[PDB]
């Protein structure tokens, strides 16, 4: 479909086009500043993915349970009957909570891994 | 505690605040040059971590043994009775040796992995 072609498709359809858009995030003092800022934004998103334990991944699973209050919808009405723009709006008030939990979860897992590697 | 809040704490206490400071490494020609240089330094540190086999990790274990001459202290007097600034000063003369060994260790392991994947 091309860049943003899946924007109007359902979440479970648009989830198969992640590489199409990922490849378009990287591809006159004000223009140079714009390029530097675009690089900084890319690196900040990559840093967030790294902190959560998701390095070379576009889809990564975590150990943070869904708390229902964030969204109490069925899977059959999110992935099959909703777009990513609608979902993003629906949980825009909770994105700074979930991310914090994700960071804490990785911090515990990373330390646990170290302890499992210290058993002779 | 916040950014650098653990600077005066022991190594085994400050090791639990790595995400707090990692998130603060990314967050007018001279100012643009300063921003580009900050990005270059970030990428050089990430490249060193990648070469050593540590990608999306803040704590990673290696196969290089401690050679004692670098520091012959007990674990009980490093992690419990020392700060990271004191440790950094103590081994500042050896950081270019350890890193070299780390690169060599990964080079051997990476090749070994390839050979283990060529056995039918």
């Amino acid at each position: 479909l091309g860049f943003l072609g899946a924007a109007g498709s359902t979440m479970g359809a648009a989830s198969m086009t992640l590489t199409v858009q990922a490849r378009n995030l990287l591809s006159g003092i004000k223009q140079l500043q714009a390029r530097v800022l675009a690089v900084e934004h890319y690196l900040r998103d990559q840093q967030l993915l790294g902190i959560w334990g998701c390095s070379g991944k576009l889809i990564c699973c975590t150990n943070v349970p869904w708390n229902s209050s964030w969204s109490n919808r069925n899977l059959s009405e999110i992935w099959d009957n909703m777009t990513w723009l609608q979902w993003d709006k629906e949980i825009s008030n909770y994105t700074q909570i979930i991310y914090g939990l994700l960071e804490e979860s990785q911090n515990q897992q990373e330390k646990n891994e170290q302890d499992l590697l210290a058993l002779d | 505690l916040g950014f650098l809040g653990a600077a005066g704490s022991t190594m085994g206490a400050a090791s639990m605040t790595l995400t707090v400071q990692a998130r603060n490494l990314l967050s007018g020609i001279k100012q643009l040059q300063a921003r580009v240089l900050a990005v270059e330094h970030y990428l050089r540190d990430q490249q060193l971590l990648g070469i050593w086999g540590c990608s999306g990790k803040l704590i990673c274990c290696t196969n290089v043994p401690w050679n004692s001459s670098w520091s012959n202290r007990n674990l009980s007097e490093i992690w419990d009775n020392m700060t990271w600034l004191q440790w950094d000063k103590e081994i500042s003369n050896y950081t270019q040796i350890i890193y070299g060994l780390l690169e060599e260790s990964q080079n051997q392991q990476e090749k070994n992995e390839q050979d283990l994947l060529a056995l039918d």
Epitope: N112, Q114, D115, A118, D120 | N74, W79
Partner: antibody
């Protein structure tokens, strides 16, 4: 100065359950790994379970792996062990012990250090 | 399980040894062979940790060593008050953590 005092129930019927606990004092609870060891009335000592200092990692002997749960609360300085099914072969004096594991940044243990008074569980 | 003699004895002032044997995958593979003294009616207390190390507060009459796939505890200067069942234990691995032997009854003449 280290005091480990076991509490919990005594005799239960086969198929029941018991929650045992251990109160610790005299040392920093959160700084040491903890474990449970049992001794049948006519036998020697047998290791049953091990929990690390942060409570995140638990290990069991295969004979209890699917039946016993070990947990700790570092703010209450309290351990607990919840046993399900309760088989005839589980009759023993259970002891609370400090040691058996370390956390990579501490020196190695691989031994049990402090032992509690012990409590007898029968089926 | 580890194998120990069921009984050891000697006269006061003499030394005695208590053996502990296993296999090459457990007692022979890791140098973590501890010993405990369990007085009748009491909980076991730590006497030896590591292969050769003693806890602080324990008398220097208790020592030990290992060779091959075996280990032993040596009690020098045996006293009339050393009435206890002695146990050996060792770290086995990341699947099976600790293995204990049977108790050895120490009789002091």
């Amino acid at each position: 100065e280290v005091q480990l005092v076991e509490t919990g129930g005594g005799l239960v019927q086969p198929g029941g359950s018991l929650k045992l606990s251990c109160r610790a004092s005299g040392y920093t609870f959160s700084s040491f790994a903890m474990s449970w060891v049992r001794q049948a009335p006519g036998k020697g000592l047998e290791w049953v379970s091990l929990i690390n200092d942060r409570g995140g990692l638990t290990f069991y002997v295969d004979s209890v792996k699917g039946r016993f749960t070990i947990s700790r609360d570092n703010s209450k300085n309290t351990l607990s062990l919840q046993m399900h099914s309760l088989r005839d072969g589980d009759t023993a004096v259970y002891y609370c012990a400090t040691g058996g594991m370390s956390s990579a940044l501490q020196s190695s243990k691989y031994y049990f250090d402090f032992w509690g008074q012990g409590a007898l569980v029968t089926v | 399980a580890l194998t120990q003699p069921p009984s050891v004895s000697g006269s006061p002032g003499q030394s005695v040894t208590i053996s502990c044997t296993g296999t090459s995958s457990d007692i022979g593979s890791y140098n973590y062979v501890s010993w405990y003294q369990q007085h009748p009616g009491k909980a076991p207390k730590l006497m030896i940790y590591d292969v050769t190390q003693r806890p602080s507060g324990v008398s220097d009459r208790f020592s030990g060593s290992k060779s091959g796939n075996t280990a032993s505890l040596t009690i020098s200067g045996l006293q009339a008050d050393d009435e206890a069942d002695y146990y050996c234990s060792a770290y086995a691995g990341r699947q099976t953590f600790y293995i204990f032997g049977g108790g050895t009854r120490l009789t002091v003449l």
